[model samples]
Target: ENIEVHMLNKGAEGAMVFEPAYIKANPGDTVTFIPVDKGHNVESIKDMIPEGAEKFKSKINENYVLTVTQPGAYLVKCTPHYAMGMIALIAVGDSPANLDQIVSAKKPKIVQERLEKVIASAK
Candidate 1:
C-alpha cells in the first residue's frame, strides 16, 4: 500500500506539522512525502528506525518516497523546523520494538511531547 504524508506550515494541529503525524503501515508500503509548503524536507532521524531500514533525506520543496522494509517504528523530521515540532512517526508491520528507544531518546521538549502523543495513539 501507498501512504501520503503532507508537509504543511500550518495545519489542523497547528504549525509546522506533517498531517497525519502518526502512521500505521506495513513492510512494502511506500510513503510519499509531499511538500505542501516550501522549505520542508524529509529526513529520517538517526538511530530512530528499525535495524535494517534505510535512512532517507529529501531536498526542500520536492516530493520524496520511502519504501518500508522493516518491522518497527520510524521517526522522521524536517531539519529546519524540527525544533518547532515538524516531525512524524511511522509504525511498520504493527511493530514497536524500537519505540522504547524513541521514548528515551534526547530531544526537544515539544518534540518529545508530540512523539509521546503519537505513540499513545498507536493502534
Candidate 2:
C-alpha cells in the first residue's frame, strides 16, 4: 500500500466540500480528512459505508484518519452541507464490495444521487 496517505481538504469559502471527491486506496492505507475552513467535520454515513467500517471517529474540526481495511465503497459528507452535494467517495482496493447496498439504503435524495454518480464513474 506504500503506506500512502491522502489528505482531503474540508470546507472552502462557499462550498462545504471535500476536495478530490473520490479516492482510491489499497487495504490498510490511510486517508485523513482535515478541516481547513471553519465549521466543517467528517462523518461516515450510516448505510453509506462498509458493514465492518468503524465510525469516522471525528470530533468537530478535528482531523479524522480513516483506515481502509477492506475492499468496498464508502461515502462520507459534511453534515452541515450534505444537501449541497458535499459527499465524497472512498474506494478501498478494487472490489467496491458494498456499492449496491449503499446505493439501496435510504439516504438523502442528494446523497443517493451523488453516490450513484460516484459508483458509475468507478465502473
Candidate 3:
C-alpha cells in the first residue's frame, strides 16, 4: 500500500507535526514516509512512553522506509517537534491483540532481541 505522511507546521510557528496522526499497514507491506519539507524525520521510538510516539523520532529530511514484517502498532514522532504533538502511529497486521501485553511485559533489551529475531526471520 502507499502511505504518505505530511510534515506540516501546525498553528503558526508552533513547529511541525505529522498529519493524519495514525497509519495502518499489513505484513510484507512497505511504508514510506516522505518529508514534505525540510526538517522532518521518521525514526522509531525505542521506548513506548507516549502511547505511539517511541519508534521514529528526531529524524529529518530523508526518506525513511521500513517493511512491516511483524504485526504491531509503531509510533513515529519528530524529535524536535514531539512536544508540539508531531506524532503518528503505524499499525501492522490485522489485529492489535497482543501488542500492548508484549510491550509492557518484556524488558527493553529482551524486546529488542525479539524484534531482531523477528526481522531476521522475515522473508
Candidate maximizing lDDT? 1
lDDT of 3 by residue, 16-81 (tens): 656555566787777677777787776665654334332434357877776666667775567665
lDDT (tens digit, per residue) of candidate 1 on 16-112: 9998899888888999999989999989999898898888899999999988989998999999999998899998875589989987998998999
lDDT of 2 by residue, 25-74 (tens): 87878887767666666678877777777777467677777778867888
Give, for candidate 2, the lowest lDDT window spanning 10 residues.
Answer: 4-13
In candidate 1, the residue pairs with backbone N, CA or C atoms under 3 Å apart (3 or more residues apart, or in different chains) clash, namely none
RMSD (Å) of each candidate, 1 decimal? 1.2, 3.6, 10.5
Question: Where in model 3 is the C-alpha error above 4 Å?
Answer: 11-15, 49-59, 98-123
Badly placed stretches (over 4 Å) of model 1 are none
Shift of residue 98 alpha carbon in model 1, Å: 0.6
Model 3, C-alpha of 118: deviation from truth (Å): 28
Off by over 4 Å in 2: 1-14, 121-123
Q: On a 0 to 1 TM-score scale, where does candidate 2 land against the true structure?
A: 0.76
